[PDB]
Symmetry: C2
Subunit: 548 residues, 2 copies
C-alpha cells in the first residue's frame, strides 16, 4: 500500500519554521521533511480564514465554486469532496483533528438523509471518516458533540465543567486564581495540563493509534492529522511556555505610512480589537513567545510520530505533506488574526516528502512554482492511482514537481477570496451582504486585490517585499493593473460547475462530431429533407466508425 499523511497546523505562519528562515525557532523534524523532500515558497490558500480555506482544501474547488464562504457556513450537500475522489480509487480518507465542517442539515433533510446514518455522518464530516473529529475550540458552553479529548482528560483524572478550557487552555495563578488562556495577558502562563495530556500530544498519539488500527484493515489511507495549534487560545503546557522570550521575537513588519489614506477595507481591519491589541509591543512580546512554544511542541511531537512510523516501516510507503490553513499577522500590518491577503496570512508553508523512488531527483530542493492549496486534492488522487476529475477539481496535481527535476508548470496566477459580510467592514464600507467581495490574484511578483465598490489594492513584492506601498491608484502601475485585472476577468469566467459530465465523456464521439452527425446514432433526425439524405449520412457514420 501507498499511504498519505496530510499534516496541517491551524494559523501557522510559513516564516515560523527554521527551514523557511526563522532565526530563533528550531524546527528540526519539520526541516528534515524538507531536507528529504520539496519545500514550496509560493503556496497560497484560496481563502485566509479557517472555514473557507479548509472547504477549498477538502473539495479542491475555489470558494466561488463551493460557496462555503465563511466560518460556519455549511458545505452544501452534494458538493463533491476529496473523500469521494479517494474512495473512487480505493483509498480511505480519515480525519484526526480539525476540519471546521458544518453539516448541511437542511440539504440532508430535503434528501431524506439521516444525519446520523453512515452516509449522513460522512456527508456532515465533509467526506472524512472521523477517527477523531475535534476542531479544538470549545468555549463554555458550545453546543455540539463532546470532543473525545474531554473524556480523555476526565479518564486521565482531570475533572472540570469544561476540561478543554480549564485544563488544556487555562493556568492557575500562584495564589490559586483562574488564569483564562483566552486572555492574551496569560500567554506567558503554563497550561494546567501536563504536556503529555495536552492537545498536541493527544492528537499526535491519536494519529499513532489510527495507524496501528489501519495497518490490519489493509486498505490504503490518506490520514489528515489536523492540529489546532498554534491557533488560539495562545497558551501551552510547560516546558514550552517559557522556552522563548521577548528577545526571540522578530520585529513587526509595518509602517506608519502604510496606514495613511489606506484602503478602506484594510483600515477597517486595523480597527478590530485583535488588531488594536497586536499593535502594542507589549502584546507581541507576551504572545509571540507562546506561539513559538506551540510550534516547538508540534515539531517535537512530529518527531515522535515520524519515529513511530519508521519503526513500523510506514516511512517507506507514506507520502507526508506538511502545511497550514493560513497564517497569523501577530501585529504585522497593524493587524491581528488573518484577514486580507498579505504574505503572513495567505502564503502557507508547504513541504511534501514522497519516499517513492520517483521523487529521488528533487530531494532537498526548493520550488517557487505557483501553487495553491486546492492542488492537494488532485495530487492525492494522482498519487492514489486515479485520474483526477478536472471537470470537478480546479487545481493541478503537484506530482510533476516532485517527480521531474525540470518539469513545465503552466500556472501564471494564483487566486484567493474573501467574503467579508460577517465583519464590521460590511457596515463601515456600506455594502449589501452579497456585495462584500475581495479577490486576490498573484503572479509571483505583483499581488492585486480587487474589492467590489472600491479601488484595487496592489503590491510589487520584488520592490516592496513587505507590502508597505499600495499601488492600487498609482498611475504608474496602470499596465500591471490591467494585466492582473484581465487575469481576474478570465478566472471568474473559468467555472467548473458542469460536474455531472466529464470531458472524457465527449471524446469517443469526436470523429463523428467532426465530419458527421452524432444525433443520427440515437435515431434523432434533425434537419433532414428525405430518406436518401438520412441514409447517406448513416453510411458516412458507418464509414467513420470503421476508420476508428
Amino acid at each position: 500500500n501507498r499511504n498519505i499523511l496530510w499534516i496541517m497546523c491551524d494559523q501557522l505562519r510559513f516564516d515560523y519554521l527554521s527551514c523557511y528562515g526563522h532565526e530563533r525557532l528550531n524546527t528540526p523534524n519539520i526541516d528534515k521533511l524538507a531536507k528529504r523532500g520539496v519545500r514550496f515558497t509560493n503556496a497560497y490558500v484560496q481563502a485566509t480564514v479557517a472555514g473557507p480555506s479548509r472547504m477549498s482544501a477538502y473539495t479542491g474547488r475555489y470558494v466561488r465554486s463551493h460557496g462555503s464562504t465563511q466560518n460556519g457556513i455549511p458545505l452544501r450537500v452534494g458538493e463533491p469532496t476529496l473523500g469521494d475522489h479517494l474512495r473512487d480509487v480505493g483509498m480511505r480518507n480519515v480525519l484526526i483533528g480539525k476540519t471546521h465542517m458544518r453539516p448541511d442539515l437542511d440539504g440532508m433533510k430535503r434528501l431524506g438523509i439521516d444525519p446520523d446514518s453512515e452516509i449522513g455522518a460522512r456527508v456532515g464530516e465533509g467526506g472524512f471518516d472521523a477517527f477523531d473529529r475535534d476542531d479544538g475550540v470549545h468555549p463554555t458552553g458550545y453546543r455540539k458533540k463532546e470532543p473525545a479529548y474531554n473524556d480523555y482528560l476526565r479518564h486521565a483524572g482531570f475533572q472540570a465543567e469544561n476540561p478543554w478550557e480549564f485544563w488544556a487552555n487555562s493556568a492557575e495563578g500562584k495564589g490559586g486564581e483562574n488564569q483564562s488562556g483566552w486572555l492574551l495577558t496569560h500567554a506567558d502562563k503554563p497550561a494546567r495540563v501536563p504536556e503529555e495530556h495536552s492537545e498536541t500530544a493527544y492528537m499526535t498519539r491519536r494519529a499513532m493509534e489510527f495507524m496501528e488500527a489501519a495497518e490490519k484493515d489493509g486498505r490504503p489511507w490518506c490520514a489528515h492529522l489536523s492540529y489546532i495549534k498554534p491557533h488560539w487560545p495562545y497558551i501551552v503546557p510547560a516546558p514550552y511556555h517559557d522556552m522563548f522570550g521577548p528577545d526571540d521575537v522578530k520585529p513587526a513588519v509595518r509602517s506608519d505610512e502604510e496606514l495613511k489614506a489606506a484602503h478602506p477595507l484594510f483600515k477597517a481591519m486595523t480597527e478590530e480589537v485583535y488588531s488594536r491589541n497586536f499593535a502594542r509591543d507589549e502584546v507581541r512580546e507576551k504572545v509571540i513567545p507562546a506561539y513559538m512554544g506551540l510550534i516547538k511542541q508540534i515539531d517535537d511531537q512530529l518527531g515522535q510520530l515520524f519515529a513511530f512510523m519508521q519503526e513500523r516501516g510506514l516511512d517507506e510507503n507514506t507520502m507526508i505533506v506538511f502545511t497550514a490553513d493560513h497564517g497569523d499577522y501577530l501585529g504585522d500590518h497593524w493587524m491581528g488574526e488573518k484577514y486580507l491577503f498579505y504574505e503572513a496570512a495567505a502564503k502557507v508553508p508547504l513541504i511534501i516528502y514522497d519516499p517513492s523512488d520517483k521523487a529521488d531527483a528533487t530531494r532537498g530542493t526548493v520550488s517557487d512554482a505557483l501553487v495553491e492549496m486546492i492542488d492537494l486534492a488532485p495530487t492525492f488522487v494522482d498519487y492514489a492511482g486515479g485520474v483526477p476529475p478536472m471537470h470537478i477539481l480546479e487545481g493541478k496535481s503537484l506530482l510533476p514537481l516532485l517527480h521531474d527535476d525540470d518539469s513545465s508548470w503552466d500556472r501564471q496566477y494564483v487566486f484567493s477570496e474573501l467574503d467579508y459580510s460577517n465583519l464590521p467592514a460590511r457596515l463601515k464600507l456600506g455594502r449589501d451582504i452579497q456585495d462584500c467581495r475581495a479577490t486576490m490574484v498573484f503572479d509571483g511578483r505583483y499581488k492585486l486585490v480587487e474589492v467590489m465598490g472600491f479601488a484595487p489594492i496592489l503590491f510589487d513584492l520584488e520592490v516592496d517585499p513587505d507590502e508597505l506601498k499600495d499601488l492600487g491608484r498609482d498611475p504608474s502601475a496602470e499596465e500591471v493593473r490591467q494585466r492582473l485585472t484581465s487575469a481576474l476577468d478570465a478566472w471568474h469566467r473559468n467555472t467548473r460547475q458542469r460536474i455531472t459530465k466529464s470531458d472524457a465523456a465527449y471524446r469517443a464521439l469526436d470523429p463523428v462530431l467532426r465530419e458527421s452527425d452524432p444525433d443520427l446514432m440515437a435515431g434523432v433526425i434533425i434537419g433532414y429533407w428525405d430518406e436518401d439524405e438520412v441514409e447517406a449520412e448513416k453510411r458516412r457514420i458507418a464509414r467513420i466508425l470503421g476508420e476508428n
Copy 2:
C-alpha cells in the same frame, strides 16, 4: 386556494402568435390571455436550447450556477429547485409534459438515494411531481421509461412497435408507403393519428384530468403544462396539416452580406444540415405551414382547457403563464434550430394572466421591462405567499409588473449562455471542451455576445432590428462594447453559490456587529488582553441588546 398554470411550448417563436403580430396565424385563445393580462416584449431565456434553458427555468438559476449546460447533462443532486421552494410554502409542483430532466444517478448513488424512492423519483424529476412525464421525442429505439402516451395509443386501438413514431409522427402515403415525420419533406402530410388522440390533444386532456384530481386533494398547485409541439417532428394531424400554405409564410430574415466575414461561431452554425436545408426556400415553404398548424392546434386545445377551467371556477383563482423554452430560426439568419442569441431563438413569448384584483390595473397592457425566464421561479414563490430566497434564486419576482401600473424595475441587462462543446463548432474553432463559451448581454437596444477566444458579436437592434450588421469589431462601437463587457464582468462575479445561509440570517446581529463583537456572545474571545477588557465589551453587548 390560489393556483398557477404554467404553460410552455417547446421551440415556439414569439412572433408566431397573432398578439405578437403574426399576420396569417390567428391565435385567439392565447391572445385573450394577453387581452386580460400582461404581454412581455423583452423576455429572454438563459440558454436557447431545451435542456439548459429548462434547467434555468426550473431552478431560477443561471447556467453558470447550475452547471447543466447541454441537453442530457444531469442536473446535480442537491441543486435547489422550484419544487423545493414551492413545497416550503405549501404549494405542489406538478408536471404534465416535458422537462428534459436527466437524473443525477451518480450523485444519488453516492448519497444512497434510491432513484425509485419517493425522494429519489422527485430528485430525478427536477423537483416535479410527475403526473405525466413525457419529453415528446421517442425514436426507435430510445431507452427510457415508456411514455404513458404509447400505452394510451395502444389502448385506443393504435398498435405499432413505436406508437408515438408510427401513429403520432408519421403519415401513410396514398399507396401505403410509410412517410416518416422525422423527414422535412413530409411536413405536408397528415399524421396517421386522429386529432383527438394526437400529442397536443392528449396532453391537454391530461392537464384537465390532473385538475379534476387536484381539486379534492385540496392543496394549492403549480401545474406545468409543457407541450412538445411545435418542436419537431414537424408533422401534425388533420385538419391542421393543410390549414396553411406557402403564401402564409412570412419572408426569411437574412442577407447575403451577413454571411460575409461572419463571426466564426455563426459561420459554423450555418454549416449544419438543418441550417443548409432551412436555407432553401423549398424547405421553408413546406415546413413552416406545419409549424403554423401545430401552433393553431395548441391554441384550439388551450381554448378547450380554458373553457374547462371556467366551468369549474378555476379561472377565478389560477394565474396562467404562457411561454416557450426558446424559439426556432426556420431559416432566419441562414440557420435552422436555435443556437446563438438572435431574437428568433432567445426572445420568447411571455404572457401572464393573474385573475386576482391586484392585477386589474395592468390588464391588456404590454411591458417592455427586461425580463428573464429565471424570473418565473421567484414570481411563483411570491404568488404562493413565500419570500423568494434570493441567495438561491437569481432573478426577480414579476409581481410588481402585474400589480403596479407604474412600478420601478431596476434590471438594466439580461443574460443568456451557450456551451457549444457538443457542437461541431468546438472542433472547427479549435477549442478545448471547457472553453466553448459564449455569453449574451442585452440592454434593450444593444446585444453583445462574448465568445471566448474570439471577437464579440454586437448588434444595435434600434438601427438594425434584423441583426444583420455585426459591430463586434467596428471601431465606432467601442464605447458600447466597453459598457456591455463591463456588465458581463460584473455579472460573472455576481455569483449565488452561498446557498446554505440566507442574507436574512445575518441581519439580527447587525447592531452588535456595528459597534461590538458578536463572537463574545458564544464565548469566543479573540484578541482581548485581560478580563476587564472582555467584561467591558460584554456590558456593551448587553447595552446594545437592550436598545434593540
